[PDB]
Design a protein around this ligand. Structure first.
Ligand SMILES: CCCCCCCCCCCCCCCCCC(=O)OC[C@H](COP(=O)([O-])OCC(O)COP(=O)([O-])OC[C@@H](COC(=O)CCCCCCCCCCCCCCCCC)OC(=O)CCCCCCCCCCCCCCCCC)OC(=O)CCCCCCCCCCCCCCCCC
Ligand SMILES: CCCCCCCCCCCCCCCCCC(=O)OC[C@H](COP(=O)([O-])OCC(O)COP(=O)([O-])OC[C@@H](COC(=O)CCCCCCCCCCCCCCCCC)OC(=O)CCCCCCCCCCCCCCCCC)OC(=O)CCCCCCCCCCCCCCCCC
Ligand SMILES: CCCCCCCCCCCCCCCCCC(=O)OC[C@H](COP(=O)([O-])OCC(O)COP(=O)([O-])OC[C@@H](COC(=O)CCCCCCCCCCCCCCCCC)OC(=O)CCCCCCCCCCCCCCCCC)OC(=O)CCCCCCCCCCCCCCCCC
Ligand SMILES: CC(C)=CCC/C(C)=C\CC/C(C)=C/CC/C(C)=C/CC/C(C)=C/CC/C(C)=C/CC/C(C)=C/CC/C(C)=C/CC/C(C)=C\CC1=C(C)C(=O)c2ccccc2C1=O
Ligand SMILES: CCCCCCCCCCCCCCCC(=O)O[C@H](COC(=O)CCCCCCC[C@@H](C)CCCCCCCCC)COP(=O)(O)O[C@H]1[C@H](O)[C@H](O)[C@H](O)[C@@H](O)[C@@H]1O
Ligand SMILES: CCCCCCCCCCCCCCCC(=O)O[C@H](COC(=O)CCCCCCC[C@@H](C)CCCCCCCCC)COP(=O)(O)O[C@H]1[C@H](O)[C@H](O)[C@H](O)[C@@H](O)[C@@H]1O
Ligand SMILES: CCCCCCCC/C=C\CCCCCCCC(=O)OC[C@H](COP(=O)(O)OCCN)OC(=O)CCCCCCCCCCCCCCC
Ligand code: HEM
Ligand code: HEM
Lengths: 92, 223, 55, 535, 52, 52, 37, 203, 139
């Protein structure tokens, strides 16, 4: 009871009509809420590529290369799953 | 001594013949041969406890010794008789020398430590990391005989400092510096371990910064 | 408390066994906590003054 | 007659000058009373302490590589060749009363300065205190952070020491000399020749006591002036709009609490200078190229650069009869880090499209993408900082050094992504929690309904309640919501007597009634001002 | 005389609704589900050891 | 019942399980490895002398 | 289950409250044959 | 927000109405204390095995228990239990400040007990006996020092409960919290009585 | 709470019998007399169940027959105000993390990480306990 409701008029300025919606991100209008999926897909692919490329180096070790392979493989698998699901409309 | 040799043999036969095969020859891929290691190597290694070793790993860790001084001497005498090699220092009475190994000069000992020891251990004998699971341990537990014998016989991935390379006077100075740096109180407060940047930054972020943020939260108003 | 700690800082700074003591020497313990006492007194004094002001 | 003296001095001031209007403006200036807005004040106060201790240190420090045998008081270093810088640092530590304390509190103040700059940067970035206005303020603040980093780098390198000289040899020499087109030319021009050139420490002393601190002071003046005249932004709240500042005036409350906070911060710094040992240069022998330790780390603010050096995978290029060492990789990495940090507000505005004049902060949860990016960046910074410490981490926490190095290498691309995803989802879920609180009221204890065995949490609505039980959902207003009746008027009136004994009932009733009346008055004033503004 | 249901129940749920619950979970039902998933993860981890 | 007796406590129980479990698994990342001695962890084999 | 596990509670009489709830006719039967074993 | 949807004057109340129903907090505390009894049972088993394997002179020659300092501390712990029960009575009443006084003196006497145990530890360590020094020393130190850690935990609970009473109005919730803290303190003093009778008298 | 108390009373009877018989048959007919580990463990698990059962019996005599204990008790009989059950809280995870930082400090013998884990544990336990008592901020 000892609390007063808040009235806020923040200055707005993309108009959010495209991208994310309040049902998905409740505070979409209040700040940057949408990162294009292409950005994250390409970022994951480049992270996997960097992990694979680190195999080429001055290390006589081999478990290091195998760890890089595994992490790059799971990253690529996640990116591929996301891309495939969004291509099919989030199915399976 | 005859009985000392016999006791060393009996301890050896029921302690290490599984990995330093009888006849002191090493078991291929379990332990090196102890021929030529000498009494100093046995004293250091067993007294630090590394040798009753129950795993083959990156490094044999230290542990409580499995033998008392008399049994350490027995094992060392047995190994010295079988192989023949460096001998642990001893005082006038016959016991392993502890105070006699404190070199008079400490500046010289510190210079030698920095040139040779700090390379991996620390500025002041705290531990250090090594390539693959190895590490140089803190020297604050080691007693003067242990430090001297560690130099005399490179235990593991540690350069072997012969008497010719580091005259016993230089080793005594290094021992004096090690003990002095270990037993010396931190001037200026609690030395957070011995590593400056990392413990100092953590203590900042945890003690000073939480204090500042908590005081700011007390003074200000959440909103 | 801030004032008493400031006076403590003054008295400790003026009269305390400062100066390096070689090693294992009588007075080495006093020297080891000489500087910590300076900092303790100073920080406690000004921190107590600040706490009083905040209160 | 102190009152008469004060009145006469005020009349004299207002006759010689005419500062009445300006002084009244300064005193009446309103500052929001949020705790997170004191984070910059922490950095400012630490900077002031740094200046005060640095003057004292300069009164006793001698910058020079001129070799000297100590012949001082510290026995463990006697007759050892050392530079005059190291000798006078040892003299400050030992043969000057309180010199050890002064240098220790100076170094602790440097560490707190860096840490508080980092925390203030986090606050502003996550609350969006940089967009449209204050973007130049963010830019100069980024320059200030970089200057502080390098200032501390030159500071702890100032007393020629084994640890700090090894750090200099690594970074300043190797990185500088590896740069392709002009690397050796920059190295020789900074060091007056080869690495141990006889002018390095004097040059760093100039840079560290006058040049860089002068620039830091000028930029702090610009920063504070910008904050002062571009009125401080505030979080959304009851009476807080984009065209007003709700808080407390400078004179009565803000000034006193800021001074008290300065006192407490300097008290914390002094306590830590006393009780905690920082940079025991006496333990760290004089610099010699042939000697080194295993730690070999820089202060925590340069620890991320050092960790980048450690983690980057030894990629070297050899053009026609030339070499491009791995130092250039880390140099370009630092350049990119600083460029992105300086240019973020413009990058953010280009990406999103918002150039609107923003005076109301936004809660980090309300901006999932930016809080996610900041969490990702903080994760990368922490990864690099701990990679620099992998040596001691491996030593103490028994993990192989190669394992720590490769954990850093893999994480610096894996951990940022994990933290980004987790922070994004966490922000959205905080928003969802806020919405559920808005539409259902706060949660409380469970009650079993009379006729049937239904269990209902017996919520408490935060707004007008519909004719039936369920309330009319409110609309989110960018301000925190009370998720515990704890923090509302529920169970908050203990006997106001004392810790050990009570007070008379009449006094207790008077006190509690007066407090309740004051709370009603404050809430009503906020409500009426809000209604007047929005109606 | 007929009910307006969804063709299929909500498959997963809106972004960012579970992560904060897990941290702040106080519903035994969710905690029990966290137990089952986490415990089963250790079954796979511990079970993989048996294969070696 | 609607909930457990101490529903913040059972939340702590899960997290104590999870984090307690992880630091036991953490023996693997160490160069030496996890605990050599069997699940039973008999006394003489477990002391600092054996399995150090 | 709804948060707090229940919007209702049936008459609890035996070790099968839900069986009694869903099959009231069995309630008498579950008692008649109980002791036969 | 007319008045409140939950007609309660405390954001946090008793977890069940204790007049007709058991106090859940008390039940849980009693069960957990019964478990801590088994923890101390493990410690007692260690001590008794060492005692059995001792060769007649259970406290070795170097060690010598100081009843002069062990009787005052146990008496002080019993007094602390009595004062804690008085504070429990205050908490059963609405006497916030009476509870605070009783629990403050209980905390002071428990701190005195901890300091006396530390003094006896210092004296014993000076006179030879040590954890690594002897099996008797080690089992004695494990038992009595784990009890001392439990006493420190009880002291922390006391100060924490007192802070809670300071920050919120006294209610049946805080009364029950005081009651369960007192249950912990009574369990601690009972296990101390057992440890005293075992270490010193029974030996 | 008659059945709740009687369960622990039965457990106490059985554990007391087990402790007594073990102590007797180990004092005599054992290689080295009383085992002194199993005996103590059995005695103090008897004590565990005895404490719990005694408290439950005290409560059973102190409280009238609850609806839960009463057969033929309608749901409406127990319908009423259940007490405060803590809603969402993130303090348990912090307590677990602090205790884990103390535990790793104990495992890897790091007094500094023990000292900090314990501080951490005190802070998080204070937060959990004060969660629903921290009055509104007074400015
Ligand atoms: C050394 C110094 C002593 C160490 C112990 C100090 C902690 C006690 C005070 C904590 C409670 C508090 O600040 O609120 C009461 C009150 C704050 O009132 P308010 O902020 O106006 O309103 C608070 C609302 O109720 C808002 O309520 P809320 O529920 O939103 O949270 C309230 C409060 C506390 O809420 C909690 O989360 C409770 C848990 C914190 C209590 C810690 C106690 C045990 C600490 C042991 C070691 C600490 C490390 O939030 C804080 O965490 C405040 C910062 C204190 C953190 C303490 C260190 C971590 O402050 C005081 O009574 C004095 C506080 C003075 C400032 C000092 C705080 C920081 C110094 C400690 C860190 C030093 C590290 C070096 C070691
Ligand atoms: C160094 C680091 C340490 C920290 C220092 C930084 C502190 C900054 C806080 C600013 C406070 C301030 O200036 O208030 C003064 C303020 C001046 O501004 P005002 O009165 O509001 O005038 C109307 C607005 O300025 C009209 O402005 P507006 O609100 O329309 O917005 C325009 C604004 C546009 O906004 C900006 O761009 C402002 C930011 C300026 C950028 C960089 C300039 C600062 C660089 C500082 C470098 C330091 C090194 O431009 C400015 O006002 C720039 C003013 C530059 C002053 C900066 C002071 C530093 O009023 C006073 O002068 C009150 C003090 C009166 C002094 C006389 C007292 C008695 C006389 C006794 C004498 C001897 C007694 C013997 C008998
Ligand atoms: C051995 C490991 C020690 C474990 C000790 C904790 C286990 C106790 C659990 C059963 C007790 C009944 C219970 O449900 O606890 C309520 C509560 C659970 O709250 P909830 O589930 O949300 O329900 C609301 C409560 O029922 C509402 O009741 P409440 O919140 O008001 O609880 C009342 C008392 C609840 O009654 C108690 O728990 C008695 C406290 C005795 C524990 C003293 C530690 C002894 C071990 C030291 C030697 C090792 O709360 C207090 O005000 C005093 C708490 C003081 C705890 C001090 C622990 C510090 C440990 C570090 C000591 C440093 C020295 C070593 C070096 O549990 C706690 O507050 C204890 C925190 C867990 C600490 C674990 C440390 C790791
Ligand atoms: C052995 C040895 C040498 C030991 C000593 C160590 C050493 C070398 C140095 C440290 C020694 C000293 C001198 C320590 C104390 C430092 C010091 C001056 C502390 C002052 C704090 C104090 C004593 C407070 C007493 C309590 C009290 C009554 C407070 C109210 C009255 C006071 C003092 C008000 C001070 C107000 C204050 C902090 C002014 C700072 C002036 C400056 C630089 C900026 C002002 C300013 C501020 C503060 C903003 O926050 C701000 C935010 C947004 C936009 C603009 C501004 C802005 O312009
Ligand atoms: C900030 C930290 C968070 C990082 C997030 C990123 C998460 C991804 C981690 C990537 C892990 C990469 C591990 C592989 C790395 C690698 O390639 O190195 C190996 C060593 O393998 C290993 O153990 C692998 C251990 C992997 C465990 C990773 C644990 C993650 C922890 C750190 C997460 C907790 C984080 C805590 C956060 C704290 C928050 C602070 C606020 C081999 O070295 P070596 O030892 O020389 O082995 C030789 C033989 O090969 C050879 O046959 C034989 O002959 C011998 O020579 C042998 O020595
Ligand atoms: C809040 C402000 C207060 C700050 C703390 C100030 C404390 C002041 C202490 C009293 C004055 C200074 C005493 C200086 C005397 C002194 O230095 O103290 C050593 C102890 O040292 C230790 O072990 C640590 C013991 C544990 C207690 C201290 C722990 C405090 C940490 C937690 C504070 C930093 C915060 C970090 C947070 C971590 C969590 C991060 C998530 C004791 O000797 P010792 O133990 O034998 O040292 C070994 C040589 O001997 C031996 O050769 C040598 O080789 C070494 O082994 C050496 O350790
Ligand atoms: C689920 C998978 C389950 C996989 C579980 C397998 C576990 C077994 C591993 C080690 C056992 C102890 C042997 C220890 C000795 C190693 C064996 C050997 O000798 O194998 C031949 C060469 C090296 O020859 P080298 O003589 O060692 O000398 C070299 C330079 N001088 O390696 C090879 O081609 C063969 C590869 C050998 C090990 C590589 C394993 C690393 C990581 C796998 C994937 C991580 C995935 C992360 C996912 C995010
Ligand atoms: C020497 C370093 C710094 C000092 C002395 C300093 C000081 C301050 C102070 C006292 C404030 C007002 C109080 C507050 O907002 O917390 C402020 C605001 C601000 N600072 Fe800094 N800060 C520093 C570093 C930085 C950095 C690294 C950035 C980036 C930055 C950007 C900003 C911005 C954008 C504001 C405006 C915030 C607002 O208007 O609410 N500052 N600074
Ligand atoms: C502006 C931010 C500053 C930072 C971050 C900073 C940081 C540091 C640090 C970390 C040290 C190492 C102290 C030690 O190792 O004991 C140091 C040394 C020093 N600082 Fe600064 N400082 C700053 C400003 C100043 C100023 C303004 C002055 C002069 C007024 C100054 C004068 C000195 C001197 C003379 C030393 C050498 C002390 C020694 O060798 O022990 N510093 N600085």
């Amino acid at each position: 009871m000892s609390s007063t409701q808040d009235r806020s008029q923040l200055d707005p300025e993309v108009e959010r009509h495209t991208g994310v919606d309040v049902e998905d991100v409740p505070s979409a209008e209040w700040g940057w809420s949408h990162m294009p999926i292409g950005v994250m897909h390409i970022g994951g692919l480049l992270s996997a590529a960097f992990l694979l490329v680190m195999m080429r180096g001055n290390h006589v070790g081999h478990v290091e290369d195998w760890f890089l392979i595994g992490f790059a493989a799971v990253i690529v698998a996640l990116v591929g799953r996301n891309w495939w699901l969004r291509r099919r409309g989030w199915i399976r | 001594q005859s009985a000392l040799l016999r006791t060393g043999k009996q301890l050896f036969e029921t302690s290490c013949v599984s990995c330093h095969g009888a006849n002191l020859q090493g078991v291929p891929d379990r332990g090196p041969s102890l021929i030529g290691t000498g009494e100093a190597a046995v004293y250091f290694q067993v007294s630090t406890g590394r040798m009753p070793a129950m795993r083959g790993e990156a490094q044999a860790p230290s542990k409580p010794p499995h033998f008392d001084e008399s049994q350490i001497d027995a094992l060392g005498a047995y190994v010295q008789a079988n192989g023949g090699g460096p001998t642990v220092p001893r005082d006038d009475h016959g016991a392993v020398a502890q105070e006699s190994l404190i070199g008079g000069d400490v500046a010289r000992g510190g210079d030698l430590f920095r040139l040779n020891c700090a390379s991996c251990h620390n500025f002041t004998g705290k531990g250090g990391a090594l390539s693959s699971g190895k590490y140089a341990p803190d020297l604050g537990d080691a007693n003067p005989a242990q430090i001297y014998t560690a130099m005399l016989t490179g235990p593991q991935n540690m350069p072997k400092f012969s008497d010719r390379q580091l005259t016993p006077d230089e080793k005594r100075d290094i021992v004096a510096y090690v003990r002095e740096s270990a037993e010396t109180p931190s001037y200026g407060g609690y030395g957070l371990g011995g590593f400056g940047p990392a413990p100092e930054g953590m203590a900042m972020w945890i003690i000073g910064m939480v204090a500042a943020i908590g005081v700011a939260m007390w003074i200000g108003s959440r909103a | 408390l801030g004032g008493l700690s400031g006076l403590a800082l003054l008295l400790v700074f003026l009269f305390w066994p400062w100066e390096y003591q070689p090693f294992g020497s009588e007075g080495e313990f006093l020297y080891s906590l000489a500087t910590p006492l300076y900092g303790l007194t100073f920080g406690l004094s000004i921190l107590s003054i600040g706490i009083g002001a905040v209160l | 007659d102190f009152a008469k003296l004060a009145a006469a001095q005020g009349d004299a001031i207002d006759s010689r000058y005419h500062p009445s209007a300006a002084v009244r403006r300064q005193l009446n200036k309103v500052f929001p009373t949020h705790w997170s807005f004191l984070l910059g004040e922490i950095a400012l106060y630490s900077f002031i302490i740094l200046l005060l201790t640095g003057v004292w240190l300069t009164l006793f420090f001698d910058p020079s590589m001129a070799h000297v045998t100590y012949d001082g008081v510290y026995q463990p270093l006697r007759g050892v060749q050392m530079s005059r810088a190291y000798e006078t640092a040892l003299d400050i530590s030992f043969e000057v009363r309180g010199g050890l304390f002064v240098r220790q509190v100076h170094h602790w103040a440097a560490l707190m300065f860096a840490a508080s700059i980092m925390v203030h940067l986090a606050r502003i970035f996550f609350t969006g205190a940089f967009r449209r206005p204050r973007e130049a303020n963010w830019v100069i603040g980024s320059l200030l952070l970089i200057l502080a980093m390098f200032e501390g780098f030159f500071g702890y390198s100032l007393p020629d020491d084994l640890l700090s000289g090894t750090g200099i040899r690594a970074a300043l020499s190797g990185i500088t000399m590896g740069i392709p087109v002009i690397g050796t030319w920059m190295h020789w021009a900074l060091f007056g020749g080869d690495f141990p050139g006889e002018i390095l420490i004097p040059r760093l002393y100039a840079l560290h006591i006058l040049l860089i601190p002068g620039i830091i002071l000028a930029l702090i003046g610009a920063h504070l002036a910008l904050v002062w005249f571009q009125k401080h932004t505030q979080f959304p709240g009851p009476g807080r709009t984009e065209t007003n500042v709700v808080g407390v005036r400078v004179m009565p409350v803000f000034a006193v609490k800021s001074g008290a906070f300065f006192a407490m911060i300097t008290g914390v710094l002094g306590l830590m200078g006393g009780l905690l040992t920082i940079n025991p240069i006496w333990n760290l022998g004089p610099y010699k190229p042939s000697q080194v330790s295993a730690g070999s780390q820089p202060d925590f603010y340069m620890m991320w650069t050092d960790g980048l050096i450690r983690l980057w995978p030894a990629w070297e290029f050899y053009p026609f009869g030339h070499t491009i060492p791995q130092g250039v990789w880390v140099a370009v990495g630092m350049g990119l880090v600083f460029a992105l940090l300086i240019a973020y507000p413009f990058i953010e505005k280009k990406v999103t499209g918002d150039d609107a004049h923003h005076n109301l902060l936004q809660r980090p949860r309300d901006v999932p993408v930016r809080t996610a990016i900041g969490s990702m960046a903080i994760a990368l910074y922490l990864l690099l900082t701990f990679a620099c410490m992998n040596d001691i981490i491996a030593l103490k926490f028994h993990i192989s050094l190669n394992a720590t190095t490769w954990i850093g290498r893999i994480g610096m691309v894996v951990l940022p992504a994990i933290v980004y995803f987790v922070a994004y989802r966490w922000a959205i879920s905080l928003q969802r929690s806020d919405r559920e609180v808005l539409e259902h009221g706060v949660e409380t204890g469970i009650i079993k309904r009379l006729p049937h065995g239904a269990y209902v949490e017996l919520h408490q609505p935060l707004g007008p309640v519909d004719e039936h039980g369920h309330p009319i959902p409110l609309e989110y207003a960018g301000a925190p919501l009370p998720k515990r009746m704890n923090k509302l008027g529920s169970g908050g009136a203990p006997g106001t007597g004392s810790f050990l004994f009570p007070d008379p009932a009449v006094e207790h009733e008077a006190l509690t009634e007066a407090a309740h009346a004051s709370e009603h008055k404050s809430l009503t004033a906020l409500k009426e001002h809000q209604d007047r503004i929005h109606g | 005389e007929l009910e307006a249901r969804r063709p299929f129940p909500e498959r997963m749920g809106p972004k960012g609704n579970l992560i904060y619950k897990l941290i702040t979970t106080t519903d035994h039902k969710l905690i029990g589900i966290m137990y089952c998933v986490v415990c089963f993860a250790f079954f796979l981890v511990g079970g993989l050891m048996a294969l070696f | 019942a609607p909930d457990v007796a101490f529903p913040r406590l059972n939340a702590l129980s899960f997290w104590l399980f999870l984090f307690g479990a992880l630091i036991a698994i953490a023996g693997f990342i160490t160069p030496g490895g996890a605990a050599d001695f069997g699940w039973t962890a008999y006394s003489p084999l477990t002391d600092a002398i054996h399995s150090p | 289950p709804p948060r707090h596990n229940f919007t209702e509670l049936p008459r609890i009489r035996s070790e099968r409250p839900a069986f009694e709830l869903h099959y009231p006719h069995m309630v008498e039967r579950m008692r008649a044959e109980a002791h036969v074993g | 927000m007319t008045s409140a949807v939950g007609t309660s004057g405390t954001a946090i109340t008793s977890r069940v109405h204790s007049l007709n129903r058991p106090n859940m907090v008390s039940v849980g505390t009693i069960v957990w204390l019964s478990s801590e009894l088994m923890f101390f049972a493990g410690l007692f088993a260690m001590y008794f095995t060492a005692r059995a394997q001792a060769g007649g002179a259970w406290p070795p020659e170097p060690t010598e228990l100081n009843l002069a300092l062990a009787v005052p501390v146990t008496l002080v712990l019993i007094a602390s239990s009595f004062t804690c029960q008085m504070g429990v009575f205050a908490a059963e009443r609405g006497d916030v400040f009476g509870l605070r006084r009783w629990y403050v003196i209980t905390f002071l006497m428990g701190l005195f007990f901890v300091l006396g145990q530390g003094y006896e530890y210092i004296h014993l360590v000076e006179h030879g006996t040590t954890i690594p020094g002897s099996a008797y020393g080690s089992v004695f130190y494990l038992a009595t020092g784990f009890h001392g850690l439990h006493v420190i935990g009880g002291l922390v609970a006391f100060v924490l409960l007192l802070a809670r009473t300071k920050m919120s109005k006294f209610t049946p919730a805080q009364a029950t919290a005081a009651i369960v803290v007192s249950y912990y303190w009574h369990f601690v003093d009972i296990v101390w009585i057992a440890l005293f009778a075992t270490i010193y008298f029974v030996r | 709470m008659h059945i709740e108390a009687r369960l622990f009373e039965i457990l106490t009877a059985f554990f007391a019998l087990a402790a007594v018989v073990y102590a007797v048959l180990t004092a005599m007919f054992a290689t080295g007399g009383v085992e002194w580990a199993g005996t103590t463990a059995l005695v103090l698990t008897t004590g565990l169940t005895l404490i719990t059962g005694t408290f439950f019996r005290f409560v059973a005599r102190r409280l009238d027959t609850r609806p839960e204990d009463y057969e033929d008790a309608e749901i409406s009989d127990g319908a009423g105000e259940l007490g405060f059950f803590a809603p969402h809280s993130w303090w348990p995870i912090l307590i677990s993390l602090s205790f884990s930082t103390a535990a790793v400090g104990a495992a890897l013998w790091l007094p500094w990480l023990i000292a900090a884990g314990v501080a951490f544990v005190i802070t998080s336990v204070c937060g959990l306990v004060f969660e629903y008592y921290w009055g509104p901020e007074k400015h």
